[PDB]
């Protein structure tokens, strides 16, 4: 079980383009993909933690 190519598309780009998602702007994305909203905040937090394990090379100090 799994979010869509797309859905985790868009949220990688909602992520590149803003880190923390407000109220309206949370319901924006989780309209666009079509996710109920809590799954689309859990994202964005476990992005966060698996952002800077990626973002290696550059972020090594920290």
């Given at each position: 079980?799994?979010?869509?190519?797309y859905?985790?598309?868009?949220?990688?780009?909602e992520?590149?383009?803003?880190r923390?998602?407000?109220?309206?702007?949370?319901?924006?994305?989780?309209?666009?993909?079509?996710?109920?909203?809590?799954?689309?905040?859990?994202?964005?937090?476990?992005?966060?933690?698996?952002?800077?394990?990626?973002?290696?090379?550059?972020?090594?100090?920290?």
């Amino acid at each position: 079980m799994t979010y869509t190519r797309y859905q985790t598309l868009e949220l990688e780009k909602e992520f590149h383009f803003n880190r923390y998602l407000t109220r309206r702007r949370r319901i924006e994305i989780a309209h666009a993909l079509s996710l109920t909203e809590r799954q689309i905040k859990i994202w964005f937090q476990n992005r966060r933690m698996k952002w800077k394990k990626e973002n290696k090379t550059k972020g090594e100090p920290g």
